[PDB]
Ligand binder design. Sequence first.
Ligand code: ATP
Ligand SMILES: *[C@@H]1O[C@H](CO)[C@@H](O[C@@H]2O[C@H](CO)[C@@H](O)[C@H](O)[C@H]2NC(C)=O)[C@H](O)[C@H]1NC(C)=O
Ligand code: MN
Lengths: 257, 59, 370, 293, 178
Amino acid sequence: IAAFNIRTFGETKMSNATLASYIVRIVRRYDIVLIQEVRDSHLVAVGKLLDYLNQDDPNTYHYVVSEPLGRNSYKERYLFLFRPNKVSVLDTYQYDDGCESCGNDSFSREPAVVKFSSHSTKVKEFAIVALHSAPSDAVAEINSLYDVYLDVQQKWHLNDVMLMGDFNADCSYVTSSQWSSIRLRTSSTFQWLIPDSADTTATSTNCAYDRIVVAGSLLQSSVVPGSAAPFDFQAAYGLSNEMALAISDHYPVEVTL
Amino acid sequence: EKVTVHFLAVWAGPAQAARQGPWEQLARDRSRFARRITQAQEELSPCLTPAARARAWAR
Amino acid sequence: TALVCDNGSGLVKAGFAGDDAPRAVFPSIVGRPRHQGVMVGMGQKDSYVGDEAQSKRGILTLKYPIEHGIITNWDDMEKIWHHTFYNELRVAPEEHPTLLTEAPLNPKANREKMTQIMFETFNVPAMYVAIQAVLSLYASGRTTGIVLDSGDGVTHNVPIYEGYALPHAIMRLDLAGRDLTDYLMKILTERGYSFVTTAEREIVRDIKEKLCYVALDFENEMATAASSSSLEKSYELPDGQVITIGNERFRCPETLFQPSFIGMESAGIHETTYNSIMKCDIDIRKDLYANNVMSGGTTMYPGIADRMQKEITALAPSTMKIKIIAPPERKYSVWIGGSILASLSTFQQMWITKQEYDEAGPSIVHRKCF
Amino acid sequence: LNLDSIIGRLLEVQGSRPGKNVQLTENEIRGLCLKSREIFLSQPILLELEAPLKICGAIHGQYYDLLRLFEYGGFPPESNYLFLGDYVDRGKQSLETICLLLAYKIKYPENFFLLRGNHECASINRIYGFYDECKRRYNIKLWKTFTDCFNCLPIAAIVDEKIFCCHGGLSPDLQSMEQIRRIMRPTDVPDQGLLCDLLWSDPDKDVQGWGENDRGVSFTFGAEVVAKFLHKHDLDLICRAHQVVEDGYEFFAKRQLVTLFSAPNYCGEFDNAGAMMSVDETLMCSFQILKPA
Amino acid sequence: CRFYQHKFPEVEDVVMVNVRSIAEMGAYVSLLEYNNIEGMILLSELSRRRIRSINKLIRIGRNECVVVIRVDKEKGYIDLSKRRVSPEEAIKCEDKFTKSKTVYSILRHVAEVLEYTKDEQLESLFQRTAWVFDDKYKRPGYGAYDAFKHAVSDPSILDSLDLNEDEREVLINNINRR
Ligand SMILES: Nc1ncnc2c1ncn2[C@@H]1O[C@H](COP(=O)(O)OP(=O)(O)OP(=O)(O)O)[C@@H](O)[C@H]1O
Ligand SMILES: *[C@@H]1O[C@H](CO)[C@@H](O[C@@H]2O[C@H](CO)[C@@H](O)[C@H](O)[C@H]2NC(C)=O)[C@H](O)[C@H]1NC(C)=O
Ligand SMILES: [Mn+2]
């Protein structure tokens, strides 16, 4: 499973035959990958991405994509790519975060929630919660994730929930004194697999921006300790610093089940 | 003079939006089209009678 | 009560008889997913139609099942009508007589399948099929004349006398809305702009509809274009950038008058109108010349009225009284005319009823609808 | 018929940004219609009511103001209400208003009362919006169901033989209360006669006796006409609701009559107040007023 | 031909109308300044039937000035309001109507000598005379009228117009007959 913010993933980026080659190779490593920050008004890029991957066999990857979400003109989708021979989608829903016109909706980009059927593993039912946080609203939004967990329990009678994505979590975004305000960390229900020391930035900075957080007894015992780590595609594919930034400013976060 | 004054100001949103209705400006925009049939009927019908409806394809 | 569904290449116009405007206007598009997936919070959809189909076109294969005025794919067409009744107008078809419209000189085989689908698949209580050009004339409030119906896919000249089309004079020019848009895209590209993203490719149509016009004197303004200070106008893009458009404003609709610009050997709309009159009986030409009515969205360009007036007077006999009528409502004249026809008390006995089809079969359409 | 789920959904949206529609199903509103017309026929055409109660005037489809109106005087049954009509035209949400009122009528048939206004008439709400409003958001077959309930609505009320209430005003043909009881329902509004007169006339400060009414289908009456009717039956001043007055209320005969109009900022064209009269257990009269924005 | 370059009035202008008929939903009227195209005046105020609406129909011989409430150039409708015109606003309308009518009357005699038969031919004459002053001075109506009065004392006002000697004499003549 991966969560991959592809900076300005759009028509421009997908029409470059070179960039397409490298992106496709990354996706193929993974059986489920969430692509965030899809700035694609009419889904042209998404179509072009699935075509490339699905040229030979039409059912290599299925998708779950959202409507454009947002209070303002800037709107992004959540794009789920999954292998239908490995998992099935039984149901999906958009979290009801309330009335946008009232000014009460708790999230600018409402989490997408997907129920998966996974026949090959010990855990039989689990949820994936998607979050692309607003840079300037990271503190408020991460706090709101506490409420999303309770909602999932009511609908599906499921305690086993995995939370993953671009949390925008870091030194400046969450400072030492603010860490004590986040219940999800101070509570022992949640194991934080990506520690503060990991470097998930392709620049020369040392920031643990990307995180994966897991809740529930069943799911927790299925997680292989220590498998969560950044994949330096620059190192593995021997690239220059210039092309790395041209692809994206985030590394993928991966995990093995 | 027992007036309980309620100088009650905006507490919902667009106060002037939900008072002036489009219905008086859609029923009026109905008759002026409803009357156009009758004026047309006195010019359009004489080409829609069974005796003449068979005349056209004859010639 | 009655429905009017104008099935167009570009836009479907649908609504209720008696209303002055169509309820729903949406692209005549049906899209089927090229790939397997779902929209968040939805069950699997097999097709999208219209507005929703347009906005998600990236992951779909788009079909325009109305090509040059003629319905050419009945599987797709079934899905456009299903969308019109159930989703857009939110009515049950079995309660409402439904007037459909057909292109001029629609082949006989095509006509019959239209009648068949309505009765067996949708169980409509009544139906009628009207030639679009004829409906346009009715809405302008006259019964004799020649209609220039120019739309998105096809342009037709249809001379009409005493309410019924004249088959010997219909001309077909395969130059219409989407050819002009494509031509504009080419010559705007030649100026040194780029329309790459879909968001940027669809707006070119909008530019055409708002700022373009037909020049009164072509020769003068082609030389004057660059020099003039007032001709050139600016249109603001959604990001903020402002591009400048010059001679392209008036060269584009000129294509209507000189199809050669895009490689069609057909004659221009001014010439086709003339050829149409001379194919008719000498007995009626006086009335045709005096009632050139222009119809459809692509005739909406400001200035076209004055330009047609000039070009036709040059070709006709010297003393013929010529008048071009350009009704302000002409972007919906086809539909509005359908709205009037179906509302007349006289018209209630001309409907094809459910009873009649059961006795006669699909071939009834030729007896009753012409 | 589960009245509270329908009513609950209608009321949940109170306090939101104006403009938000409520879309019941066609079968539900038909359900509201089919269960509405039974209680009215079972009660007298001339109601006999008890205090305490709250009295309020014309609404003209300003639904968000109706919801605001109940926030102050008390929801049933802590205080009783009678509305005097004219709630189905010109405003944007006539349907929600009338649908809500009938649902409350069924819940509280002895504590909530509605009279017929002149807009409760097929030929009127054909012209001024309601016919058209049903066509856009619903359909005309359901409109016909509406033209069946209105024909059985009451037209006037007398509180404790001392306050005479009705939508329009008096008639030169009204000599005994029995003449009202004898009018048969369901009925259309005739082109002449008592029923018409009760729904359309208006007072005028500058006429003596009987004058010509600008409304046409009825009449005006002067100050001397008012005194004789009250005098014959030993009655006092009269309170009615059908006019538009800048202050929300306006006296015109040295405080012998008051007009109520309850929709403030009327259809966005005026800066008038809307007023409500609050009558306590001892019949003391006060006013509730929505000042202009 | 209409009086002014534009073919429709702008929202909020007050214009004069002739009441043509009474129907259930209001009065149909002719705009005297816009070549008698049809508009409407909404129900004046409050509520009303058709029976005594004839007491509100004395405008047919009064030609009331009313304000434009809504325009829809595509559909072709003009809705008007009598209720919102103040008496002070009304005084200007009587004055404007007389002034604009005067320009028309000068030009109507002009139209007779050249025997125009089509509205567009008459409009083009207007385009080169009355409407030149209206545009030049950005005062619809008032511009043409003020200039014609001046021509008694300042004949040069016609010089810039594209007219031959014969065209000029007949125009000048009709002013003197005033
Ligand atoms: N103001 C305008 N200027 C130029 N083109 C326009 C304008 N408005 C609409 N169009 C074009 O007109 C076309 C739609 O016209 P219309 O709806 O008459 O066609 P249609 O009726 O769908 O097709 P058909 O006429 O073949 O049945 C589209 O190509 C649209 O881009
Ligand atoms: C796709 O994009 C990349 C980077 O955006 C392109 O690589 C650059 O291409 C330009 C050509 O205009 C060169 O001038 C640069 O030197 C290149 N930079 C780098 C870092 O490689 C690539 O050429 C594009 N490919 C296509 C097919 O458009
Ligand atoms: Mn009333």
